[PDB]
């Protein structure tokens, strides 16, 4: 159906600043689904299995959520003319040395759930060194 | 069933139902005079709503005084409502009346309360003050409803924000914004909110249109900002984000009442769920037997033209069918150019559409949700619907002094008017916004003790026959409180009309 | 009880049925392309329309072969319609495409072919030949849709007229006339409706869209049209005025179905009422097994916007709950900006509405209606839909050659989909108007008479299985004929899926 | 509820011509019809006769209709932003002659039948004389 | 509703309905001549019940031949009952019990009617006796003391039908209990799908009288009405002085109480106790029933070789007989204990195998045309199985007759 791309993983300093990009492809159909009309959730897999949630930002982008771990660093964002989401990271820390990947839902709204998500990215490396 | 019903239909047949759905018309520019008041009030006019989000003490005071004088011309109980400004980011207003924006431009972004008139392409004022301590470089800041999206890009002053414009719309004044970053920490009730709230205590409205609702706390946070003087004001929670869909229950639970403001929900939601959604809250609020009220996004074309789209219409008639008890208009009643038109439309939708639906669905399917050993309460008032429905009965009377009965005989949602014999003012004004209810106000001072409860029937009876309801020869159904007890009606009788 | 139902409702939670509405697309400039048909296919286009109001045959030609091409590439069965011209006074065609009309002006109306494409706001021309001698002085002509009046002055030649208008209105091409004096006589077909009609047979249309349906002798004389190489083609009845509504019962006896035209329905009556006619004609469809199309005013707006309003998508949704078959674009589709998207859109509606319909009542409803005995047909057709709810069937399968039988299980309205294993590639396009149901084509010619239907069932659970509908371990039910009659299923199994 | 007042009867010859004016004024608040919303019949009655069918108009005016007798001679129309229905008779002959009704149904649509009526004029007397 | 059906009946219309009714019979000096047994197979009799606390195996060996030759003479297929001695005047299987038992399971009887059951335990003992040359005879299990009532539920999922012995029962428990006990448990077994048949004191005194007493006869309707599968004649048709007019008499309180019940209560209570995931097969007999009211059939043609189809249907209680076409000849004789059943024998080995299932079907028609139940343009439910399906029905096909 729809698929993800990711991109701008890679290594910087605690305190650095990252711009994580993730970009859609085609549609869904079947159901009439579309990037523009699916809520999406970045999730992070840390060394070992415990993806946890990240953020959350509805189908237009006028609601977001986060992780406490991550509030106030952290800034979801989306263009629905270019589809795709970006995860801004700044003022990063060795605690959120991780693989990132971002989902989209079925729905306008997002979930913590990842297994609530339908399509996948990757996961692209971020990697941040004391 | 609504099929077998729907077969039957004739468009060439005259209807002839007695209207039971209730119109909230909200007064403004076009109606705030006593003449305009009375022709709105003929049209079809139940509740007079103040939006409180903009307009003076002095103005609303006026708005007051005078639906209250046009009323007593008509001899008619109007209730009043206070609308809350409510917890939303305001941005100040405009010079020449209006600015226009290009994508590209640099706008400025200011919490320094000046500027709060001059308002410019270049720089305007917004009401968070902490707008510079929270949105970051970068933050959409979403204006007017979502349409317009800007972004952060510098940080100026302690009062100064630099943000690119990213649309093509031009701006009206003293517009809403709601950004979606978080850490907004929304307070329930602001200061102007507040105050607000106790002119109406002080000035005696009737009911509060509690604005943007989103826990249940919040409605609570409401009724304690009304003092011992406003325990009897009913408020009723105006649903208009996702959060007030996700806690719809306790809110339902906390509140008299719920108004589903499907404009300020399709911002946040995708409309396809808006229609759910509002399927969801209407059907919720019947079964809880609160009322509930339709209220954005009405009959908007028809403000400057003099008739309403098809789609439009049915937008109505959709609301009606839903289960909506009332449905409320919002400019086309307060700076348009057709509010008589306008409401004598509203009048005609509610008729055809309640025409159109299956007169026994809703009782039963009501009725079947009833846990069995059902109160005498419940099932006095369930009980007289269902007679009424055997009988062929033109009108219900009940004898109610606060309308809780009268509220409980609606939730059943029988077919003939339901009169309510009240000996509160209050309660027949507070009645205007449940289906299908009329009030009779019995002047204990005026008259007698009616400890038999015989003149406050007759008054009723008379009501009716004068109304147009019943003739002699008609059934009636009565349902009031005996005289061992007190608190709530538990005995009903069944009568035919003689004269 | 669809109360019940409500108050489960969750706008959280992703939504699960499978489509069962069909859409319906007119082509023109934006999609005559075979790939952006192709992308309108994949968007969830079921049946592509020809307006044949204009175009010459060469051009409908081209969509019908760009129709196939992009279908046979794709793998689908696409139905294609010819939606007639009518017999419709009409206007004619401005110098420049438009003219603007004052009140208190006068302006000629000629019917002299010479005036026929140099029309002006001082003289203009109409098909109607004689109507000169038909409209007489102090006569209303009504234009456009009753938007332009004239009042006719004086008959100042053989064959022109001199009007004065009433009211101020500008004009563009070839709009139509409503003369309301009556007396005007319509043929049911136009000469060039005729020859319109012989060019779809001869190239193989699957359905008509038979214009300005008013009787039931007109369906008939449309039939008439249609030789016998255009017999097995549906007629499908454009219902677009109040003699349409009144005829209604005659008119869906004699076609294959129905086109509730809501547009031109509110030439002539109110809105409040083209609701209530929706429901009645869609209804009375329903109980006739018949399909039903909604038409107009679709989601008019996304022709030039991005996202439609919510009035819009309200109305759409109403259809559907209204238990309309199909939904049909008009300008949407054939010279929108979006029309991908305006297709996806009615597919997400479609999906919302169906999942908040409760399964059950339009089965028991349409139950209740027939009476005892049943013909063993029927009876066959509804037991086997209530065995789908009884057993909690994950899809129906019929195996109809003509589509008889599958037409008649979507009128018990199941709750999975019904897959239809057809011999004849004609019904596996027409059946893309009938609610739930999905084609599988069988080749005779390429493989055996499958007298034990076992490879034509194999061919149906696969299908099934491979479009996630069912997996190991679900249950089907399927229909079918005996191998000791033939003509109408009269026989089912309860099959358990393996693999 | 909604009041309507006839007037333009009087002499004429026979094969004269006349204009009947009703203007209307009020509305069923009770329901919300102004005359813009209901349709109307135009009746006569004959001396020592019922209620004649005269012929019909739909709210708007795009659908009239005609008794035979007056088919072709009369012509219903109505201006909804004057308030007024008109009815003109053309070629009148003496067994037109009648007193003449408008009244209005609270539907879209007309009725032939007097009774599916709720409001009436006053009526206004023609005659129409020999010659 | 029943009220509406009763303030409609009329004591003068002449009644026409098919007895969905069977009545069991007991052999005796009266009726064990080949002649007499004839007399009774054509007075309605469909199982001839065998009592062993009296009579000798060569005297019951006389009885099974005999019905074994007047029901070959008549054409009909006649089931033989072997009712036990039990440990009368405690274990389960007397060593007579169960000398009896093997004979009867060597000499092909079609059921035992084991006496005295208190315990699922004991029935199952006697299923044990059986062996398995006698793995396929049903057991009815007689209810005869309060042991039998308070594990009724276990005596039912354990056994093939139950009987309730109302004379035994009443001399532990008061009458109006016993009342209450039949009702309990005809419609225990009537929702559990198997034969229930009533059994003592039914027509007694026609025993020595040419007409009963009315009490007696609405005791009699009373059992149909109560749901009951069949009624048991006992000292009427063995020592009795009348034993054919009373099996006529059977027939006439049969048909008209049958005709005095309503047609789709049954129906109606049986289908609202299913839980809503039905299971294809249970699926399968429901709608065949619910497609014949909804269509009127005269008749249900049912495709089964070890009859639990039959069963099934008949659980389901329609308004028409089920015919049941059937390949097993114990089949038939057992059917003969459900209500509104009849079986057809279709002979595999004499006649070409019916792969197709399209004899069988024929074969049935034929049948219930000529009984008088089904003609010409009258629709019909057939019920069977497909070429390929796992034991059991699966398919059904609405039928009408047409001239043949």
Redo the contacts between chains.
């Keep these: 159906q729809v698929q993800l791309q990711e991109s701008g993983g890679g290594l910087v300093q605690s305190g650095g600043s990252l711009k994580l990009s993730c970009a859609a492809s085609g549609?869904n159909?079947?159901?009439?689904?579309?990037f523009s009309?699916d809520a999406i959730g970045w999730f992070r897999q840390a060394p070992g299995k415990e993806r946890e949630f990240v953020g959350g930002i509805?189908?237009?982008?006028?609601?977001?959520?986060?992780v406490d771990s991550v509030?106030?660093r952290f800034?979801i964002?989306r263009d629905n003319a270019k589809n795709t989401v970006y995860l801004?990271m700044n003022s990063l820390q060795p605690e959120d040395t991780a693989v990132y990947y971002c989902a989209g839902?079925?729905?306008?709204?997002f979930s913590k759930v990842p297994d609530?998500y339908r399509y996948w990215g990757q996961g692209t490396q971020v990697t941040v060194s004391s | 069933s609504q099929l077998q019903h729907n077969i039957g239909l004739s468009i060439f047949e005259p209807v002839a139902k007695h209207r039971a759905n209730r119109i909230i018309c909200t007064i403004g520019p076009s109606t705030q005079s006593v003449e305009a008041l009375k022709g709105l009030m003929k049209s079809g006019m139940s509740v007079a709503r103040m939006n409180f989000s903009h307009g003076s003490y002095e103005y609303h005071q006026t708005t007051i005084n005078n639906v209250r004088a046009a009323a007593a011309e008509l001899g008619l109980h109007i209730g009043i409502a206070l609308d809350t400004k409510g917890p939303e980011i305001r941005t100040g207003l405009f010079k020449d009346g209006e600015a226009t924006y290009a994508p590209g431009d640099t706008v400025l972004v200011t919490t320094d309360p000046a500027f709060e008139k001059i308002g410019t392409k270049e720089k305007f004022y917004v009401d968070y003050p902490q707008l510079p301590n929270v949105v970051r470089p970068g933050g959409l800041i979403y204006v007017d409803d979502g349409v317009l999206t800007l972004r952060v890009l510098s940080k100026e002053d302690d009062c100064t924000l630099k943000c690119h414009v990213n649309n093509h719309h031009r701006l009206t004044d003293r517009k809403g914004i709601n950004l979606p970053g978080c850490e907004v920490d929304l307070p329930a009730v602001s200061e102007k909110d507040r105050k607000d709230l106790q002119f109406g205590v002080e000035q005696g409205v009737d009911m509060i249109f509690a604005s943007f609702i989103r826990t249940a706390d919040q409605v609570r946070e409401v009724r304690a900002a009304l003092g011992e003087k406003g325990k009897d004001t009913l408020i009723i929670s105006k649903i208009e984000n996702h959060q007030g869909v996700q806690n719809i229950d306790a809110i339902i639970e906390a509140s008299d009442g719920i108004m589903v403001a499907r404009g300020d929900l399709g911002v946040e939601i995708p409309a396809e769920k808006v229609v759910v959604a509002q399927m969801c809250i209407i059907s919720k609020c019947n079964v809880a037997g609160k009322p509930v009220i339709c209220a954005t996004q009405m009959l908007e074309s028809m403000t400057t033209n003099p008739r309403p789209t098809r789609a439009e219409v049915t937008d109505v008639a959709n609301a009606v069918f839903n289960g909506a008890d009332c449905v409320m208009l919002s400019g086309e009643t307060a700076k348009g150019k057709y509010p008589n038109e306008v409401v004598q439309y509203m009048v005609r939708i509610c008729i055809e559409a309640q025409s159109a639906t299956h007169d026994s669905v809703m009782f039963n399917s009501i009725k079947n949700l009833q846990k069995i050993p059902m109160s005498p309460e419940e099932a006095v008032c369930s009980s007289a619907v269902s007679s009424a429905f055997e009988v062929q009965a033109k009108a219900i009377l009940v004898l109610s002094n606060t309308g809780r009965s009268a509220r409980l005989i609606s939730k059943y949602r029988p077919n003939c008017p339901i009169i309510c014999a009240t000996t509160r003012l209050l309660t027949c004004r507070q009645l205007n916004v449940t289906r299908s209810v009329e009030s009779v106000y019995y002047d204990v001072d005026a008259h007698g003790e009616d400890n038999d409860r015989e003149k406050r029937v007759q008054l009723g009876v008379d009501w009716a026959k004068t109304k147009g309801y019943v003739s002699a020869g008609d059934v009636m159904v009565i349902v009031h409180a005996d005289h061992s007890v007190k608190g709530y009606p538990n005995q009903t009788r069944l009568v035919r009309v003689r004269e």
């Design positions: 549609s159909f079947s159901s009439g689904r579309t009309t509805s189908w237009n982008g006028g609601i977001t959520d986060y509030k106030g800034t964002s801004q839902r079925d729905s306008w709204y609530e």
